[PDB]
């Protein structure tokens, strides 16, 4: 489905991870609009950025991001175990359609 | 200009005459298109062109223009002011066009 | 605030036209554009296409375009979707969102937020 992403990035409870979100030239690039929903294994997914880097009512600090120009990345900063989950990247996909990431799992041992 | 509102006109007993005003300060504007619209050529006879509007893609929307009300209502209220010294005291409006 | 609630499992056999639906609820339902999305078991979002629901223009991703029909629903607020020449690949729970805010200044439809979900519809097509 395009924008591909690391597919699995795994970690343990502390540090920080960089997730990313690739696009060619339009779908990110173009404008900047982006955002990252965590689906909980086998579930519907939530809400936790908006405008590449804010954030919506009922998120923490850790669930931060920034755009890199051709690339957007969240960044779970302190990661731990309620990061069992996977971080879809949606954005701008040019024209008038909005594309969705290939997905991410993140994995806490 | 830069001192403070100017009213001209030829004769102000004719009702006829057009007045033109001079603002001490500007207003800022700002008109859009908000439709993203599209642009095809089709070619007539030799190689003379000729476009066209294609399709809008996303959203339709209308076009609009936006003025600060803030300094238009300042702006209206002094060239009011100023207008009531050349016709004496009298009330002063504005109406449709 | 809002709810969606949209229905439960729906069978259907290929080829034919499904009808997947989603029933907003606690919020005005003509102040907010909905968005369709697929999920097939294993792969991550697909995009599916945006709903106005105020007027009934319509759009859908390349991948669907021509397949896919919908229609509001003004009176309930349960938005409709059509999927014909249905395939068993469609195999994919289908998802109903609210998009962002419709207003008369600026379009909205692409604006990706999502706020609010459905509760995932299994559908299966064999």
């Known amino acids: 489905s395009a924008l591909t992403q690391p597919a699995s990035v795994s970690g343990s409870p502390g540090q920080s991870i960089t997730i990313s979100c690739t696009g060619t030239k339009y779908d990110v690039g173009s404008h900047d609009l982006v955002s990252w929903y965590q689906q909980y294994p086998g579930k519907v997914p939530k809400y936790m950025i908006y405008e590449v880097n804010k954030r919506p009512s009922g998120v923490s600090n850790r669930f931060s991001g920034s755009k890199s120009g051709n690339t957007a990345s969240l960044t779970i900063s302190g990661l731990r175990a309620e990061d069992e989950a996977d971080y879809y990247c949606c954005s701008f996909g040019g024209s008038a359609t909005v594309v969705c990431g290939g997905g991410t799992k993140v994995t806490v041992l | 200009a830069e001192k403070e509102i100017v009213i001209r006109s030829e004769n102000l007993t004719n009702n006829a005459k057009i007045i033109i005003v001079h603002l001490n300060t500007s207003v800022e504007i700002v008109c859009t298109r908000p439709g993203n619209n599209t642009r095809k050529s089709v070619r007539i006879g030799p190689g003379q062109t000729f476009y066209a509007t294609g399709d809008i893609i996303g959203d339709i929307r209308q076009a609009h223009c936006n003025i600060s009300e803030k300094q238009w209502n300042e702006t209206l209220q002094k060239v009011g002011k100023e207008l009531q010294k050349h016709f004496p005291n009298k009330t002063i409006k504005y109406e449709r066009s | 605030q809002v709810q969606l609630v949209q229905s439960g499992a729906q069978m259907k056999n290929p080829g034919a036209s499904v009808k997947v639906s989603c029933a907003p609820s606690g919020y005005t339902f003509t102040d907010f554009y909905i968005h369709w999305l697929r999920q097939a078991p294993g792969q991550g979002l697909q995009w599916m296409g945006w709903?106005?629901?105020?007027?009934?223009?319509?759009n859908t991703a390349r991948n669907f375009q021509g397949r896919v029909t919908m229609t509001r629903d003004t009176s309930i607020g349960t938005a409709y979707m059509e999927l014909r020449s249905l395939t068993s690949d469609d195999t994919a729970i289908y998802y109903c969102t609210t998009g962002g805010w419709i207003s008369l200044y600026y379009d909205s439809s692409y604006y990706p937020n999502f706020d609010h979900w459905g509760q995932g519809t299994l559908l299966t097509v064999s």
């Open positions: 709903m106005n629901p105020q007027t009934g223009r319509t």
